[PDB]
Amino acid sequence: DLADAQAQVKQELDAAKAQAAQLIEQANRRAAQLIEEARTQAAAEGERIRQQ
Amino acid sequence: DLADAQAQVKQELDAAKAQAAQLIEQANRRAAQLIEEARTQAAAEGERIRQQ
Amino acid sequence: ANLKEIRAKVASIKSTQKITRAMQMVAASKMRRAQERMAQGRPYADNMRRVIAHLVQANPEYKHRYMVDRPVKRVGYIIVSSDRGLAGGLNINLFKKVVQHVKAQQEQSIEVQFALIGQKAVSFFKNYGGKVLGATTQIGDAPSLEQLTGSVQVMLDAFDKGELDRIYLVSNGFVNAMTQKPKVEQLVPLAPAEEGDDLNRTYGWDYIYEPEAEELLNGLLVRYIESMVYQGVIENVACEQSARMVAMKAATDNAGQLIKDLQLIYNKLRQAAITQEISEIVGGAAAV
Amino acid sequence: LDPLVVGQEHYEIARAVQNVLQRYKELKDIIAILGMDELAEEDKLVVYRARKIQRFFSQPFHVAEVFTGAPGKLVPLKETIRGFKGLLAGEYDHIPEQAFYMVGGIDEVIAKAEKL
Amino acid sequence: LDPLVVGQEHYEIARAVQNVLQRYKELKDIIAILGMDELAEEDKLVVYRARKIQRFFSQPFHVAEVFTGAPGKLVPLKETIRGFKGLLAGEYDHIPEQAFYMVGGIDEVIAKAEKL
Amino acid sequence: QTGYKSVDTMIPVGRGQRELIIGDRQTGKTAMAIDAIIAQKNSGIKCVYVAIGQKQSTIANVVRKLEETGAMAYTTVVAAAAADPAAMQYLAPYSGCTMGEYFRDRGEDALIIYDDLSKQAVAYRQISLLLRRPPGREAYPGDVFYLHSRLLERASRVSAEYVEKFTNGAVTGKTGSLTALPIIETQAGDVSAFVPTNVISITDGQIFLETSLFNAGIRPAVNAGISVSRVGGSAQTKIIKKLSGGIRTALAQYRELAAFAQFASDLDEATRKQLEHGQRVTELMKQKQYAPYSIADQAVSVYASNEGYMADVEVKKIVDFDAALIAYFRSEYAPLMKQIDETGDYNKDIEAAIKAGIESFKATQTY
Amino acid sequence: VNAGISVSRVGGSAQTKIIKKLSGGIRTALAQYRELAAFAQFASDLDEATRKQLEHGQRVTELMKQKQYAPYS
Amino acid sequence: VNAGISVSRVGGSAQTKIIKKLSGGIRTALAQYRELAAFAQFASDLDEATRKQLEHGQRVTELMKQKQYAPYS
């Protein structure tokens, strides 16, 4: 069981690092999507002002 | 049981990853409204130029 | 403005005023009952004190661990409270006293452990944190000694291991029929209880100890401490009854004041309504 | 009084102050029939904070010094916001409520508490 | 509702049901504060029978025909009198209260309880 | 759809109904009406807003706010300001109702909002008193009820046969409608006065706004205890109709025993859990201004509340939880959100998707 | 009949001798029962004296009930 | 004299400088004392500030009393 312990410890640390990679990669991608969407909204709004 | 302790210590890594993700999302979401108001005021000053 | 609603509210308040008067009636009777029950526990403690004092003075060879003051590292508290509220500020004042005492013990760099009796204390010191050792709930008005052996046994067992050095008893004192005062008193390091008795008047006879005197002394001390805890709980019950009586009387007076205010408001509104009705009738009649 | 005109922070402070005052106004009836000790600890804390808030809105005007005698005070907006933020955060729970009466910014409160 | 016009058993059953219901309505605050455990052995039967009675007033409407199943019941008065006399007496005290819901006569509630 | 999680779930409003908005001054009646107008961006129903006895600055501000959000492209504003003669303030609602009825008789849908019918009643009282007509209660003329009735009764829904007959066969397929949202103001919550009693009798419901709830932070201040809608469930989409039961019963239970709210320390466990859930559901109903929710957002929030996913979050943080959850769904699950918004269905697939999304949010997002 | 506020100003001189003699017990029983009716709900720590008064008052109150069309001579 | 509701909008300009500078916020002192005593009828803590204010308000209240036809100077 002592030998098993370190193997499980490593198999937890690597999974934690994989979670780190995945979610941190998701967050900034969502942020970029939000930036683009806000830019599109502003594009829609400015031309409305000009047409008015 | 100390292997169980390393499992605990990895949990903190997930919590830190999540908070860092939210911080990124917020700090770059705010830039979107920055851009929104910038385009609004640019349209507004163009409106004064065109009304002149 | 729907005056019948105000009339119904006044009637309900006057009914609750009658409700509280009877609760005061009952609380006085139970205060009397607990007060006369406190007296029946006196002879047992008196006889035990006499026997223990004579035994310890006649055989001064050894000192028991409950009668010697060793240096303090941790202390203990046995906190007795009520099970339901609506009894003045009894529990609040008691908890303020114990909290201040604990804060004073903190600067001495000695930590504390607790043993709680009564629902209010359980909740308050579960939210407070601390190091709880035992809990007891639903004591009642006339507790049986069996219900109290748990907390005192836990505290004494913790004392025997050297974990504890003092064990304070936290309760209320019955000053008179209307006033109660919080108390914080140590019990396990038995303060010499009138040990000056039976030294000038002592005689030249000792008992015939069927067991060795040491075991007998230990058995006496345990029961004596338990009896002290019991008759400290009973006094708290009496204090709770007195506090509830006082609180009910105060509530009756406050309801009586509310009635006198709502009556004035109702009268003003009644006159205003009559005036409005008459004005409208006269206007409608004159317009036709 | 909307977030788009006065800013987020000022709006939040004003709404929190109004919420505290409203809850105290609702508790005022129970503490009259029953006692102050029937309430939980949060409600007692709210009552104390609300009394302090009510006191802190008092102020000596420049034109009212004829009636009382104390000189007037002129409190900038930033001082008001900073004082009320601290008072809501609980930083001033150790100041007696009589120190919030007829004073200017939050510094006068601390000075008066120390004088007492 | 007069014993001269509706007979004596009808009036007595109605009075008993009204008494049970208006005592259970009074037990509300005590049930909410303490719970069902600390009530006396009497006034627990009242709670159970009052809940059963409240359920048994439910009725499926024929004209609906949707979500019900076109269940025209039109129970004779004698059936209701028998049922409520039995329920007040206690012959049906062992049946779960969910059986008395959305049925007609006592035969239907017996069948529903036995099915479950 | 009005866009409020409380109104759309507990006091629904259909097409052709007449829902009253009643409450004390400065409680958010005009804000609710304007949000209802704004939420109609995509439903494609024309709106008409009538202002009676309001200073022109407020009318201008309302018009500017409608223009900022783009909701003026389909709205008509009728303005009878406070300086206008009493005849104009008396006639304005009828002339707004005619402009609304133009759309009803031709197959299209419309929505008209009378602002402060109390001021129309006051103007008509002034007109009648100067003509020496006999007054009644509170010096109003006897026929105020008939003044309001023949105005509110025009808001209705007409069948396809009527619209086909009216247009001589041009609009055969469809059916018309016209919805009204009259607004009344009461003095110190006195709903027993003359005009509010008359108006409550005619409309198909009401929405009470309370001052004490407004100060305490609950915005909008909708009072669920005494707000009803006689149309009821038939005016809701399938999913919201299926989901609103939990909200309604939670508020009912939390309201039955609100008298003991300050005594949670001295109670059993069942009622304490009931209070714990009722406080959370009450906190859920808060909402900002000018930001309405589509039906998908309401469905997601209400489902997350029903299945106890909010039971482990402290009360002070529920609003942030809800906003973050809705944003998370808007980001990750766009196709599902559009599926719910487009139709309103509710199947096992939709429930499973919603539950999976909620679980993944709680696991991996940390609002 | 609300016995608390009901009144007859003619008084004793409008009764036969037997009922005039016997009415005092009824009047005082209703008075005592109405004074301490609040205790009827507790019924736990009632001392001996007041419990007797409650027992008599409730019994007299139950006595006064009557049907319709059945007068008593 | 109810110190809570009583004012002189002329203020300190209507008295000689002695009384003008001696009498400060005496009226407001009593106005706050009334409310504090009404709110703290049942206060079991009575921190020293409130105790001082309540022990001063009673002094000031009992101070202002005089008899019919007894003009001071």
Ligand SMILES: Nc1ncnc2c1ncn2[C@@H]1O[C@H](COP(=O)(O)OP(=O)(O)OP(=O)(O)O)[C@@H](O)[C@H]1O
């Ligand atoms: N959900 C909300 N969140 C924040 N603020 C709100 C919300 N709803 C309403 N308010 C605020 O309530 C304030 C006062 O209410 P409102 O402006 O709607 O006037 P009103 O109810 O029409 O009264 P009156 O007829 O007397 O003018 C508004 O300034 C608005 O910003």
Ligand SMILES: [Mg+2]
């Ligand atoms: Mg308005």
